[PDB]
Every structure is written in structure tokens, then in C-alpha cells.
Amino acid sequence: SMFLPPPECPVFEPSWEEFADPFAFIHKIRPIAEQTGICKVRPPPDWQPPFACDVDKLHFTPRIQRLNELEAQTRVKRDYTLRTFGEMADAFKSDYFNMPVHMVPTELVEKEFWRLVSTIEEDVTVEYGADIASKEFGSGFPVRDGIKLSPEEEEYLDSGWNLNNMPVMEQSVLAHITADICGMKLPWLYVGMCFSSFCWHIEDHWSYSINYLHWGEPKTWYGVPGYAAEQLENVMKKLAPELFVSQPDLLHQLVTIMNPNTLMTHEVPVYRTNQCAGEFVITFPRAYHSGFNQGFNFAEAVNFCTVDWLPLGRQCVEHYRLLHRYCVFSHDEMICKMASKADVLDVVVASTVQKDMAIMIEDEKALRETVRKLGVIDSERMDFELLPDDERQCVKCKTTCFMSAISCSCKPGLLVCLHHVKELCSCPPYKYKLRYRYTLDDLYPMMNALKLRAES
Ligand SMILES: [Mn+2]
Ligand SMILES: [Mn+2]
Ligand SMILES: [Zn+2]
Ligand SMILES: [Zn+2]
């Protein structure tokens, strides 16, 4: 067996005027959609980006997936062509149900999915495609190539809803970021089949995600609002403790399939949707989501960060520190990079960055005063952004250091953040060196440049 489908998530049908600015639209729907975690967006009927691809020239290596509820799965980063994957996908669904591939009701695939994952006697294995755009398999949206593009492709090249453009827009905060963060700025391509699934998870740095289904059979989604994040985690901790153990890196993240009715029983609010071809799904910050594909399909997705997200991004890094979780990027480094480009930032962006920067500076000032009281006297400026990430992680909590860190000559190359000064070595703190990116005197004019830009 019995599956009680969760209630439907919100569906938006913006007019062209509403649709024209994705960021202004996302900000508008936010009071409703953040209460459900996920929402669906149907574009105006005339917004139809062109989908064209040779099925024989598009190749990918599929991932194998066992379909077992509460079984640990890794969040990752034979070879099939899009044609041979489609032939296998259709033959699988058609043989599973003994029905023509398009005649299988969605409510039946959903009930069946939840029965199959819960039955121990069922040993159903599926395949899927998951990767960033490359020369072997590129974006489903039109892109500029030095390849003559048709006027239909030109129309959708500059679109805010073309997922290649979303990261580099002026209302996006991940735009101006220098660091190599491939998995967070570049779109991901997903080739699905019946029962292929995506386990319960939240985006890196509690970012938003936007997902477009280019073509094929629907994608079923389950979403949990950001406010119920810890409530969901507490339920998952009780039922599957093995998923909550310490991991050696970001490449070793453990995720699972879990029935939304189990969450619903534990008073966790859950919403559903069937995303069809030509529809978007937006996930809000810290909103848990999972789902499965109804059949053969092709989707494209990207992470994004708005000005609304900036305080949550800082709260996320603080949360990663408490859990000893690796960061994808330094949040402080992104803030200081935006401050250094204050003259070319959007006015609303400059205003929001200034507010986060004021918190960063006050927190930093307090941390430095605490470590001076521990007896750390020696200090030296250090350009943290030049170090590879793996060379600037706190020994204790794994945070990516930017603003400051503690070093000792007895442990070359090792660093601790200011929260973990006592975790470096057994030397007295007078042997330590405070390594800092900026003095407080360098920071106040950076923040004032944002203030001038915000007031113009
Ligand atoms: Mn099973
Ligand atoms: Mn996701
Ligand atoms: Zn030492
Ligand atoms: Zn630390």
C-alpha cells in the first residue's frame, strides 16, 4: 503493498512577462515553494527550445543501480550510445509490465517502484547516465560554437532558462567565483530508464537546483521543505545508521532510497510531482529530494545561488564544520572576491554581499581576539586562494580555510581553522603562527566599496 501518494507540490504557469526573469520569478514564488521544498514550472506554451541530437554519436558509460530501500548508495562524480541505451530501456519496461512502453500508468510505475525497493525477494537492477556536459555528450540546450546555429537556436542561446546561462547571470552569486568548482557551475546530463533513481539528498552548500526534462517519459519527484531537513535526518538516522558514519571525502558520500510514507508517518512533510518533458523542477535551499524515472528520458540540471541564499550558504559552512564535512568552495573567499569586484556588481547583489561581509568581519575579529588570548602572537599574511583545496583544510573539521588558519613549524603544511587551535600539535601556542588573508584594516574599505556601489 500500500502506497499513499504524498500531496502534490505547487505548479506554476508564468506568463511571458513573469517568465522573462528567472531570478525575479524564483524570488516571487519563494514564499510558497520554500514551504514544499520543490515546485514545478511550466513555461509559456511558445517557449520551446530546439532539441536536436544524433543518437548514434552520443556515447556514455552507465552506472549500475540495485533498487533496495535503506541500502547505502554512493553519490558519484559497459558503454552505450543514446540509441542502444534507449533500446535496452524500452525493452526492460515493456518486459517488466508485458505492456507497450507508453501504456504503463504512472501511478502503477510509482506503486511498483515502492513495492520492488521494499521486497527482499526482488533483485531488480537498472542503469542510468549521469555526467557534466563534454564533447562525447553535450548540453541539451543551444550553446555558442566556432558550427553555424539556426535562428531557432539563436533565440534560446541567451535565455535565462537555458541552463548554461543561469550560473553566469548578474542575479547569481556563483558567477564571479574564480575557483575550479566544475560540479556546481556546469550543467549535469541525466539519461534515465524505468526505475532509475536519485536517492534522498540536499545540494552542496544548500544551493538551489533547476532541472529541465528535455524529452521522454516523466520523472517522479518527492520533496521536503528546508525547515524539515533535521526532522528528516533524525528519521533516517534511526532507520539507517550506517549512512551517518564519517566519510574520508566528498567522493564517499552515502545516500539512500526511503519511502515517503515512512517520512509522512514520522510527521515529516513530503510533496510529490511527475515532471513531464518541457517542464522544470526547482529545488529550494536545504530541501531534501529523491525520485525515479517512469521510463527512457533525458534531463539537464544545474545548481545556482541567489542573494536570498547568501546567509544560508554561511549557515551551511558552519554546519559542515560541526559535522567535519568537506566544502566544495570557501564561502568567505567567494564573498571577498565579490567585494574586490564591487564596481561591476549588481546593486542588490552588492547590498546583500555587504551584509554577509559585516557578519564575516565581526566573527573574524572575535576569533582572532580569542586565539591571541591563547598565546598565539606571531602572524604572517598568506594568500590562501593560491593553495589547492586539499592543502588548506582544517586537520580537525575539514573546513576550507581562507580568512585565517594556525600553523606550526613542527607540522609542515598542516593547518587548523581558528576554532581548532588546540588540535594542531602539542607545542605551546607561542610556537604558532597566525596565517591571515587580510588585516581588519584591509577588510573595512572592501566592505565600504560595496556600500558605495549599493547606494548608487
Ligand atoms: Mn528489492
Ligand atoms: Mn539534487
Ligand atoms: Zn608544533
Ligand atoms: Zn576547524
Task: Describe the fold and architecture.
- It is found in: Nucleus.
- Interacts with FOXG1B, PAX9, MYC, MYCN and RB1. Interacts with HDAC1, HDAC4, HDAC5 and HDAC7. Interacts (via PHD-type 1 zinc finger) with histone H3 unmodified at 'Lys-4'; the interaction is inhibited when histone H3 is methylated at 'Arg-2' or 'Lys-4'.
- This is Lysine-specific demethylase 5B.
- It comes from Homo sapiens (Human).
- Residues 155-321 form the JmjC domain.
- The chain is an alpha+beta fold and 456 residues long.
- The chain has a domain at 22-311: Cupin (Jelly Rolls), CATH 2.60.120.
- It is built from twelve helices and 19 strands.
- The strands form five sheets. The protein has an eight-stranded mixed beta sheet with strand order 1-2-14-10-16-8-7-4. The chain has a four-stranded antiparallel beta sheet with strand order 9-15-11-13, with helices on one face. It has a three-stranded mixed beta sheet with strand order 17-19-18, with no helix packed on it.
- The longest helix has 27 residues, at 347-373.
- The protein is globular and about 75 Å long.
Give a brief description.
This protein has 456 residues and is of the alpha+beta class. It contains twelve helices and 19 strands.
User: How many DSSP helices?
Assistant: 12
What is the highest CATH level, the class of the domain at 22-311?
Mainly Beta
CATH superfamily of the domain at 22-311: Cupin
Structural class: alpha+beta
Distance between the termini: 62 Å
- Major sheet details: 8 strands, mixed
Bound molecules: manganese (II) ion, zinc ion
Q: From the coordinates shown, what is the CATH architecture of the domain at 22-311?
A: Sandwich
Strand content: 15-25%
CATH topology of the domain at 22-311: Jelly Rolls
Multimeric status of the protein? monomer
* Order of the strands making up the biggest sheet: 1-2-14-10-16-8-7-4
Total number of beta strands? 19
- Described by the principal axes of the CA atoms, the overall outline is globular
**Helical fraction:** 25-40%
Rg measurement, Å:
24 Å
